[PDB]
């Protein structure tokens, strides 16, 4: 009858592909742009908060996960919150059992397994959300990207969401500088990458940008409308 390869997550296309995974990837691609970076001492997430209407406050996109780690969501927000709750629970469990912060890579591995589980069962659906995970642990600043395919990447900078390719191009051309940047110019690079996504008729304002930074001696802190101004001044 119908395309018979698209509805179920447990049905392989004759091309060796699962179309539900790709549709969840599209769900991520339809979300608003997020871009993250990392120096040798900091890992910054800056997100382009999108507004439903001119009278609606923009969606929160950076979410706290632990004392030392944070995420930037892009996709289905309910899936994002469920996965964020799982991350928070794992971090709290690690602090309870071992009295140490949970390493970022192991947390991302847990996320990968948890999101792979629905990839293989009937009735289940992939987590239609992509997460930019920036955290700081003993192994220096970390930034991670997780896809609905349950495949996660150890990045040096990444942008996911709508019109992400321009931000990725900017990040690629300016990768060589990020390591030696300080926090201010690192978040300036992030803001430039995020601006590369925006159309010609809009520019960054304190309303539609949020910044989350985690570093060597820095609590993970989400910077909001008023607090974004010191990072915003000096771009163009």
């Amino acid at each position: 009858f119908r395309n018979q390869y698209d509805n179920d997550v447990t049905v392989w296309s004759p091309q060796g592909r699962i179309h539900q995974i790709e549709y969840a990837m599209e769900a991520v691609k339809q979300g608003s742009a997020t871009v993250g970076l990392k120096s040798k001492t900091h890992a910054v997430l800056v997100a382009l908060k999108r507004a439903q209407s001119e009278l609606a406050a923009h969606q929160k996109k950076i979410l706290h996960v632990d004392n030392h780690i944070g995420i930037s969501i892009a996709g289905l927000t309910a899936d994002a919150r469920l996965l964020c709750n799982f991350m928070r629970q794992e971090c709290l469990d690690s602090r309870f059992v071992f009295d140490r912060p949970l390493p970022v890579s192991r947390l991302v591995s847990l996320i990968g397994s948890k999101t792979q589980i629905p990839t293989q069962r009937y009735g289940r659906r992939p987590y239609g959300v992509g997460l930019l995970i920036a955290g700081y642990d003993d192994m220096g600043p970390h930034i991670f990207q997780t896809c609905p395919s349950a495949n996660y990447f150890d990045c040096r900078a990444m942008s996911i969401g709508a019109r992400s390719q321009s931000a990725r191009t900017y990040l690629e051309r300016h990768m060589s500088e990020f390591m030696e940047c300080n926090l201010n110019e690192l978040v300036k690079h992030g803001l430039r990458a995020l601006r590369e996504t925006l159309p010609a008729e809009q520019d960054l304002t304190t309303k539609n940008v949020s910044i989350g930074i985690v570093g060597k001696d820095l609590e993970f802190t989400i910077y909001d409308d008023d607090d974004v101004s010191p990072f915003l001044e000096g771009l163009e």
């Binding site: 698209d6 539900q20 339809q30 209407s53 609606a56 406050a57 996709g75 289905l76 009735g123 289940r124």
Partner: protein
């Protein structure tokens, strides 16, 4: 294998090629069939208004409640399939009272909206327990109330996205009411002006003529609690239009 209809060729948790859950989009379409609701968050209160949509004169408007009380400091205006809104209202009330029981403090409006919104995509098939929901809630809710941060207004759709809105209109006439609220909203407008503006918009969008028995209006001020206006109290503002 015949007589099978394409109504159930897809699962509930299936994505469209554009990456949107089919059931969520269909629930959003169902929202556009509900009664129009309007909410405005001013600095001295939050007002919520909704048309009753009385089908026949034999139906008593007092029974058809489309605005409810989560607690003394939170309200909720509902549009869509009002039958599905009651589960979410009960969950919100339970969460508010649990928060008071555990912490001895009023639960933040944002926290209540978040707690209710987590239920939105908690639906599925055999993968879950027998008590699991089978379909998304066909209700959009306008949570409004006062808390430590001041007057707050929120909007939750079946997708589970909850967003803070200065002035939001939901229901059949969402687009026109939203354009009008764009035209009328100022960040420093008073609660009386908010109430009058909301009733004006409802009159503009309602098919029935605006009167004291075919709308419901409620306010949540930083002082007094959630308050439902009545006759002899809604005429006093309807007359001005």
């Amino acid at each position: 294998m015949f007589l099978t209809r394409s109504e159930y060729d897809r699962g509930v948790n299936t994505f469209s090629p554009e990456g949107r859950l089919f059931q969520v989009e269909y629930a959003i379409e169902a929202i556009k069939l509900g009664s129009t609701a309007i909410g405005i968050q001013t600095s001295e209160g939050v007002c919520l208004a909704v048309e009753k949509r009385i089908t026949s004169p034999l139906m008593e408007p007092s029974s058809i409640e489309k605005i409810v009380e989560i607690d003394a400091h939170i309200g909720c205006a509902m549009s869509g399939l009002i039958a599905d809104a009651k589960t979410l209202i009960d969950k919100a009330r339970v969460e508010t009272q649990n928060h008071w029981f555990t912490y001895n403090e009023t639960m933040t409006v944002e926290s209540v909206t978040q707690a209710v919104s987590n239920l939105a995509l908690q639906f599925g098939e055999e993968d879950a327990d027998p008590g699991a929901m089978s379909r998304p809630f066909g209700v959009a809710l306008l949570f409004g109330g006062v808390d430590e941060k001041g007057p707050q207004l929120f909007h939750m759709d079946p997708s589970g996205t909850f967003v803070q809105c200065d002035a939001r209109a939901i229901g059949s006439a969402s687009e026109g009411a939203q354009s009008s609220l764009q035209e009328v909203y100022h960040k420093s407008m008073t609660l009386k002006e908010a109430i009058k503006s909301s009733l004006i918009i409802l009159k503009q969008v309602m098919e029935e003529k605006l009167n004291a028995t075919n709308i419901e209006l409620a306010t949540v001020q930083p002082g007094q609690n959630f308050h439902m206006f009545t006759k002899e109290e809604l005429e006093e503002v309807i007359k001005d239009i």
